Amino acid sequence: PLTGLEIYKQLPKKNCGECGTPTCLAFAMNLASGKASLDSCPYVSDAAREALDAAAAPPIAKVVLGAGPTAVEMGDETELFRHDKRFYHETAIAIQVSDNLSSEELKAKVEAINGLNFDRVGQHYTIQAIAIRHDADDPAAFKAAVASVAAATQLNLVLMADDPDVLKEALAGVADRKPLLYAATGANYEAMTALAKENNCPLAVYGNGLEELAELVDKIVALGHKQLVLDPGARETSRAIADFTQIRRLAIKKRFRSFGYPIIALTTAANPLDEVLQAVNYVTKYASLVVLRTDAKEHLLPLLSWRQNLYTDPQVPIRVEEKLNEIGAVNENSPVYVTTNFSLTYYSVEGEIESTKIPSYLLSVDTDGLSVLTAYADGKFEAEKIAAVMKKVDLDNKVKRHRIIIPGAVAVLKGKLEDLTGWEVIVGPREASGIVAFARA
Amino acid sequence: PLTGLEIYKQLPKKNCGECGTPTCLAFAMNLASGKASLDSCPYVSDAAREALDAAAAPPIAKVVLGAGPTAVEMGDETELFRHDKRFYHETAIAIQVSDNLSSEELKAKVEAINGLNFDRVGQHYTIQAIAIRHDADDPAAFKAAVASVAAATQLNLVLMADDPDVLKEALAGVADRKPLLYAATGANYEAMTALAKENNCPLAVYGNGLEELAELVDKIVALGHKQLVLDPGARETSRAIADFTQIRRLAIKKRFRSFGYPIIALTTAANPLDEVLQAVNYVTKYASLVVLRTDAKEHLLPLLSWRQNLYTDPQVPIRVEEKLNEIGAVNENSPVYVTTNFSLTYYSVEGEIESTKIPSYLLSVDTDGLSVLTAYADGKFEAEKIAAVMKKVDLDNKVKRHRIIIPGAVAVLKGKLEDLTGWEVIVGPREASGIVAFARA
Amino acid sequence: MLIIGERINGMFGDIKRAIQERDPAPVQEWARRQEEGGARALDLNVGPAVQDKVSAMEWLVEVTQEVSNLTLCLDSTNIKAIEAGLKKCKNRAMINSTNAEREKVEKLFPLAVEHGAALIGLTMNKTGIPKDSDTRLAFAMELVAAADEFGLPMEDLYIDPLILPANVAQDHAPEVLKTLQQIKMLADPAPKTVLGLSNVSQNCQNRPLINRTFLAMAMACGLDAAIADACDEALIETAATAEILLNQTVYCDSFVKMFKTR
Amino acid sequence: MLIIGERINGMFGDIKRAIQERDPAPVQEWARRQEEGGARALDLNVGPAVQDKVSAMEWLVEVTQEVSNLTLCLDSTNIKAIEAGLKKCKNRAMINSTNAEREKVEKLFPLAVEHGAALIGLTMNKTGIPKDSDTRLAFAMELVAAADEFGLPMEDLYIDPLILPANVAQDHAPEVLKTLQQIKMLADPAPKTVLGLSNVSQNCQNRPLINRTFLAMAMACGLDAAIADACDEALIETAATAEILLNQTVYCDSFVKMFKTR
Amino acid sequence: MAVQILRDRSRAAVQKVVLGATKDQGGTRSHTIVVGGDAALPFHHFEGEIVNRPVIGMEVQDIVPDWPDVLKDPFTDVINEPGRWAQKCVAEYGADLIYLKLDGADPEGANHSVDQCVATVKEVLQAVGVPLVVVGCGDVEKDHEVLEAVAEAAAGENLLLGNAEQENYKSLTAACMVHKHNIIARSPLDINICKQLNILINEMNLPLDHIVIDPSIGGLGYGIEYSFSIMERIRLGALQGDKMLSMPVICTVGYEAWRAKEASAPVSEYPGWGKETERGILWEAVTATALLQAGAHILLMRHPEAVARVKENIDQLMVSNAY
Ligand code: COB
Ligand code: COB
Ligand code: SF4
Ligand code: SF4
Numbered sequence A, B: 001p002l003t004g005l006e007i008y009k010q011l012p013k014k015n016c017g018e019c020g021t022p023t024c025l026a027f028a029m030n031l032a033s034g035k036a037s038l039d040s041c042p043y044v045s046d047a048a049r050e051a052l053d054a055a056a057a058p059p060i061a062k063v064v065l066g067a068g069p070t071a072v073e074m075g076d077e078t079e080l081f082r083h084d085k086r087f088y089h090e091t092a093i094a095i096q097v098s099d100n101l102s103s104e105e106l107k108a109k110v111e112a113i114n115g116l117n118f119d120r121v122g123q124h125y126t127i128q129a130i131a132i133r134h135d136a137d138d139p140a141a142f143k144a145a146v147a148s149v150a151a152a153t154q155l156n157l158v159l160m161a162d163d164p165d166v167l168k169e170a171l172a173g174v175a176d177r178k179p180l181l182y183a184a185t186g187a188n189y190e191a192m193t194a195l196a197k198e199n200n201c202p203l204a205v206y207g208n209g210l211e212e213l214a215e216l217v218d219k220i221v222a223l224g225h226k227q228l229v230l231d232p233g234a235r236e237t238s239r240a241i242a243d244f245t246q247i248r249r250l251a252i253k254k255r256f257r258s259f260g261y262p263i264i265a266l267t268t269a270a271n272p273l274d275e276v277l278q279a280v281n282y283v284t285k286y287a288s289l290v291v292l293r294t295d296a297k298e299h300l301l302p303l304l305s306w307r308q309n310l311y312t313d314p315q316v317p318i319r320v321e322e323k324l325n326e327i328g329a330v331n332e333n334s335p336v337y338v339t340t341n342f343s344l345t346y347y348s349v350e351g352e353i354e355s356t357k358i359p360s361y362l363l364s365v366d367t368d369g370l371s372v373l374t375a376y377a378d379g380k381f382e383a384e385k386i387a388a389v390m391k392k393v394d395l396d397n398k399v400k401r402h403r404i405i406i407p408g409a410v411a412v413l414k415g416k417l418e419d420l421t422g423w424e425v426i427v428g429p430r431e432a433s434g435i436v437a438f439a440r441a
Numbered sequence C, D: 001m002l003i004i005g006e007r008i009n010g011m012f013g014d015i016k017r018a019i020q021e022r023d024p025a026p027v028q029e030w031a032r033r034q035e036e037g038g039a040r041a042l043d044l045n046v047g048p049a050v051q052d053k054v055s056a057m058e059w060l061v062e063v064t065q066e067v068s069n070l071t072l073c074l075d076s077t078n079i080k081a082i083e084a085g086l087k088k089c090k091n092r093a094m095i096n097s098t099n100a101e102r103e104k105v106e107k108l109f110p111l112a113v114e115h116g117a118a119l120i121g122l123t124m125n126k127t128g129i130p131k132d133s134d135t136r137l138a139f140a141m142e143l144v145a146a147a148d149e150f151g152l153p154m155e156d157l158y159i160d161p162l163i164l165p166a167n168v169a170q171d172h173a174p175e176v177l178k179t180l181q182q183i184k185m186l187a188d189p190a191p192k193t194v195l196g197l198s199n200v201s202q203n204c205q206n207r208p209l210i211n212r213t214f215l216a217m218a219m220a221c222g223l224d225a226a227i228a229d230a231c232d233e234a235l236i237e238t239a240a241t242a243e244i245l246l247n248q249t250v251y252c253d254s255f256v257k258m259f260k261t262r
Numbered sequence E: 001m002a003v004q005i006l007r008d009r010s011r012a013a014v015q016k017v018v019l020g021a022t023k024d025q026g027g028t029r030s031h032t033i034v035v036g037g038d039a040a041l042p043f044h045h046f047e048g049e050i051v052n053r054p055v056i057g058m059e060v061q062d063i064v065p066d067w068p069d070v071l072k073d074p075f076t077d078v079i080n081e082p083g084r085w086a087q088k089c090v091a092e093y094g095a096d097l098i099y100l101k102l103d104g105a106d107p108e109g110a111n112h113s114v115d116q117c118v119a120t121v122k123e124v125l126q127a128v129g130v131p132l133v134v135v136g137c138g139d140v141e142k143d144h145e146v147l148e149a150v151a152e153a154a155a156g157e158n159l160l161l162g163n164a165e166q167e168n169y170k171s172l173t174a175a176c177m178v179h180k181h182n183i184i185a186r187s188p189l190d191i192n193i194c195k196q197l198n199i200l201i202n203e204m205n206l207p208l209d210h211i212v213i214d215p216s217i218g219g220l221g222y223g224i225e226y227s228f229s230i231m232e233r234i235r236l237g238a239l240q241g242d243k244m245l246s247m248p249v250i251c252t253v254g255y256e257a258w259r260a261k262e263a264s265a266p267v268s269e270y271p272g273w274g275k276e277t278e279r280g281i282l283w284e285a286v287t288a289t290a291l292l293q294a295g296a297h298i299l300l301m302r303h304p305e306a307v308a309r310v311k312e313n314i315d316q317l318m319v320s321n322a323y
């Protein structure tokens, strides 16, 4: 997977045939095909080094945020759109906290951060890290902050301190874990690189625009370290989307080895509500690790919801559990509706019935998360299959009066389903939207 | 290019992910594609040389017999059938002369061997080498024999003697033009390879069957001598056709490195006429070098003619020199036939005219060796082009009339032509076969 | 190109009713109508409609080879049903189909070698159909490694990259071609391939136009077999013409007729 | 898929008579119906008969663009006639043709850059038309390199592996497809490919069947443009369908109509 | 070295649909609103012009809505007066458009007469000066009578009549042509049907600049990503020359977001989710924000604070990031 021109353009163009090939242009053909190796031609040096590295490497590199089951993976992406292919690694969420704050307020805020995990749609949303920033006067307040937070929380960390000396002294007692080193700058990158080198921690790279970022990255990479996250220095959301796209584009569409690393985004919106919406634009536009300031459950829920949806494989359908779902009151005198486990189908029905206002039982038959008609065609939805799901519930005992409602779209099944299940099958409306009419009648 | 199976088989079975790929099988996929370098896996040493060879090396290697302008390239073949692609290197015909024959009987034969050159249909056929065998009782007779042949001929040489010690003394003087040391046997391959190594000469490998051949070839390869020609030991034509096919098949379609070398055959038919036909089979069945004991000029011309025809590129058409070919003893009242220089077309015409015993002039218009209809369709046979050949060819000086005959298939060309050439154009029969009846009328 | 007739499937109205009442007449007719079309192989599927598969599969095998000698292709997921059909097969067989999962591999792979039949292998897993061709190749490579494992000739292995409708899943069609194109390069000798051609035009306007078009495109990428409608004359012509353009069969003026009368 | 109208060629009768007496009516009319068929390009050829290739070329250009805004494809081996035509082009044009000959490259490649037009490059030289795909790829690599050498947009380079009749040169068709599919490994972004489709069915029986079959097969290998009969409605449908099967255009039930009226 | 800004040049662009008409144009509106005209991916100023910013329309019904108690709170003073409801959404909340959702036309529910529906439309037209987006109730037979009468009386105002699906576009399209109005093409999360629908509507000789696409978006956490990908694929095709997908995209984020439990369910019921006040605001806001990156031109919202925070987002996204 390497263009013959890209190979030839790097060649000395001597046409000596010491490679065993009449010309370089023909040797470039043999390299793209694989007839001969590139180590044969004794000519050139740095040309052969970059070629092998570029040909056999992903566009976006992978840098892990620490070790253990708590560690998360960032970067490693090959797409600009989710429909072309699935997005692999979800956005890393990190809540920021200052060091000049009091200990009682510090612990109270950290304690609240550990509770930023939600349960919805049979799914579990969680955050990843905590950002400890240095705003105090004394450099000893920062080390007293990171060690304090690391004693309360068990999540990942990301250290934010300009002076490496202040950072290292605060890093030493936590260097064995994750803590990302934010950030390297064109004035203090040397010391910052050495800290992340010996301690084997990821190193954040700051830059003023695309240019300064690219120049600084190459220098840090040349020092031997390749575990980096990128920061174009974008503080405005419009400037962010543009810059965040370039890193994703140039690395994938141009193999830019300076932007072949994930992106760390910083929220700047003063208002917590505006920050959440600004975070949505980031988690959508190729940002890997975003740093929030607001830590409210009211705010983190819509963000973590969109993050989950965007990073779902378009191939695999969203599915709910194959277990009787009680709607409203129930009480043993309620309608039983048969449907499939596809999340989209299930909630279409769940939504319609909550609307109905009559407590209902909803049995989402396990069709591997397929919409009943599709499952139907598969034959996954069968009278034998639905009948068997009735039993697992052992529902007939559960309901005093026996009946079940079938989606109108598979109306055909009702005789066969009725006869082997022993349950009176009513064929409902083809669309769950008419469930209310059925309830009325 | 190699296969996914070929890599996985050579690959171990650790599934350790040290290469950056989860399993060994998935690593084979990345190699056949080119996603990663194989140097990551630290395992094995011969496999790295085996994979590098099999993927890069052609089916058959090339070993050169001789040195300079008189050197002939054997092997280097990639085809089973000549219609898939053209056969590249013609058969190396060699003549055998025994040493036991007296000095006068040894000179008269080689004198005739040099005269084995032929000129036919505008092409020249020649032989390649001379074979000196050892049937004498005394070893010292071989040194006097090879010296007698060395001064007589300038063609390539191939020495035949079992004992290496007897062979080396006679090899001393003629080791400059790289003779063919026949042959290597499992009983003396140690001394044979060592001798062929110092002088850098092609070493013939003998074996009683394909198994003993393949085993012995591998023994020589380990010593560092790859200039080998194979001898399956098949003395019978049915055995040879079968064996030579196997050597040719296994090397091309199975990457059998033991058989990835040209083949040397030995005509064993007692009768001289039976020998030539046996040689026809061999040169047709992938034989790179056949040794004949016939020195008659009658037995070599058809044998060399068939060799020339078989090794012609089908894609590249045979062409006749553009010019005038007088059929018989043509006078200044005889006819002039216009045609093209495609050899097939020209002899179709030459055959019909000579066959009807019509003395005449034939003008094969250069059409890059294309047939009359194609030349016409490729704009290669314009009235302009034919007119120019009428003047180009010097045919006018030859005849008292100014009349030319056009192939009936381009009958319009003739009318158009008459005007710009100043010759009277008669449109002949569409097929050269009707020429006799056209000239009669 | 090996055209495998698809009509004998339990999803159709006539075939379904011919199983419940056990009527050989419609089954035998389609076994002959597809042969006249040009199909040198027949696909036998009992369908979801029939209650028992063991009896239904064996019933189809007999009545099909009663008036035909074409290579029969058993189409089911049930392992017992497949082996049940292989028993009454007096002619050559072809198991359809299997996936890369070992639970399916261990059961069907030696079952194909035992009767010396062909094995259609799907490039899918338990989760579902892969998107990218790289994953289709991954499941294909495993089918090749499992082919050299159980000792099965590669020319009997029919890789199935699967094909989805060009309306709901249009983005799969170019991936299937990329799959087929790289299938021949991942193994030597190269495994054969087979597609459910009629699936690409499901719920699409002008189905035959889409069917034969994708067939030519698939054969250009290297398609050996194809399970489609043999009663479609326009489809047979394209399948025949593609052989000439691939230089698989020597050209003649009546190249269409010769493929139909192979 | 770009369709270049082949009908306006001097080899045809009505076209030749129209050039001799300078009659715009047949030339202008054919420009309409080919556009009605769905062609977005027109190939203009003066023919072998006309003695003044240059002035006749300029005439064809000046009368075709009068009733057509389509991209003109100047079909002439004469460089002087090619440049002369480009001087009269109201819009963007295409050059047909150039070979891998250095003497032609240094004259036609800058000529394409100067006018900012497209360039069709043949994978051949003075020897003739190669057979092996490895040989066609050699001349193709030179053309790609020549494009970058003279600063030509890579997507403006239309490489043509050249197609020959499927009866007398059947062994070329599979090689051309292997050339198209392997052309992608020459540049990034990769150059475009073009073919003279109608040549594949020369002297063959049922030409339209062979034409549209090979066109679909070539698109799967990566055919971007094709000089074929735009009046063949079955050919246009094939180009439209194969374009959908490559996910180059969002599917709709009226996909053919969206191709003709694109 | 240097850093080369990769700019993707677009072959074509998304259509420009003019909403509303002034006095000189035979209408009675104060100003006109133009959407679309984008020459690149959403908010990619560095590689294309974004001449017109996306707009936000607030939902107004002829009757009181069945919205949750939380959503009804900011409208309690004018929720039962469509004329006063529209005026507040424009003056107090600063809406760009008025989304007149006539749920009262439902024969089962309010069963408002045809003369009543057309009276409500005329009432809003006399209340505000912004362009209107009037859609039916969802009843095929009823909407055929309502939307036809509304288009005939409000002819000249250049309204945006809503929802003309695949099986039902015949009656509505004809009304838009005769009385010079725009139309909404709604498709059940299918770009193929979406493209085919725009053909059938256009084949009736209706200009392509009078059509807006409704992909039938899903709410946040309820298949929003299925619509997100479609809206992107539509956006790509529009730039790739596909004229059938060149129509601007409208989104009913109000209906899809407030029908979720996570938007209105009390904090006491779901403590892990937090206060239902701002959680409901952000639920509709994030839904709109995510779709803005997909190519949303007209957002149909409900909650005031939700609209305000989305406008702030649009205000920043329109800031040119051109290199
Ligand atoms: C919400 C859901 C939306 N519907 C969808 O989301 C499915 C849309 C769609 C395009 C179908 C056509 C279409 N768009 O109209 C097409 N597929 Co699909 C090509 N498919 C898929 C998609 C599956 C997506 C999924 N997770 O289910 C795939 C591409 C993988 C796909 C695959 C198949 N598909 C197949 C087929 C044939 C069909 N597929 C259909 C469903 C359709 C109609 C297309 C066609 N036309 O031919 C076929 C089924 C009809 C038929 N047999 O004739 C098949 C077999 C094709 C093949 N040969 O491979 C294959 C299945 C086997 C396989 N995987 O190999 C798609 C997307 C579809 O609808 P729903 O019916 O589940 O719920 C719905 C709900 C909302 O209105 O209310 C009703 N309701 C639901 N539950 C209940 C009620 C109502 C009441 C009262 C209740 C008490 C309960 C009502 O039923
Ligand atoms: C001996 C020779 C055999 N004839 C042949 O060997 C040619 C056979 C054949 C199949 C043609 C059809 C067929 N088989 O019938 C077909 N080609 Co070819 C596809 N072609 C080729 C082959 C070239 C072989 C060669 N070296 O010339 C190619 C595949 C490369 C080939 C190529 C072309 N071909 C082309 C064409 C069109 C034709 N080709 C023809 C000749 C034919 C007839 C095919 C067809 N159509 O039906 C076309 C020409 C007729 C026409 N214009 O209508 C073309 C232009 C295809 C294209 N679209 O480009 C292309 C040429 C340009 C290019 N290279 O790009 C082939 C093989 C043919 O015949 P001949 O006519 O030269 O001699 C013959 C001789 C023996 O009977 O007697 C006569 N005669 C000869 N000299 C004289 C006389 C008689 C008298 C009295 C004299 C005084 C002199 C008579 O003329
Ligand atoms: S040895 Fe190197 S420089 Fe010489 S021709 Fe080969 S590739 Fe070019
Ligand atoms: S490094 Fe070698 S042994 Fe280890 S998993 Fe990779 S291929 Fe297998």
Ligand SMILES: [Ca+2]
Residues within 6 Å of the ligand: C192, C193, C222, C223, C224
């Ligand atoms: Ca094949």
Ligand SMILES: [Ca+2]
Residues within 6 Å of the ligand: D192, D193, D221, D222, D223, D224
């Ligand atoms: Ca291409």
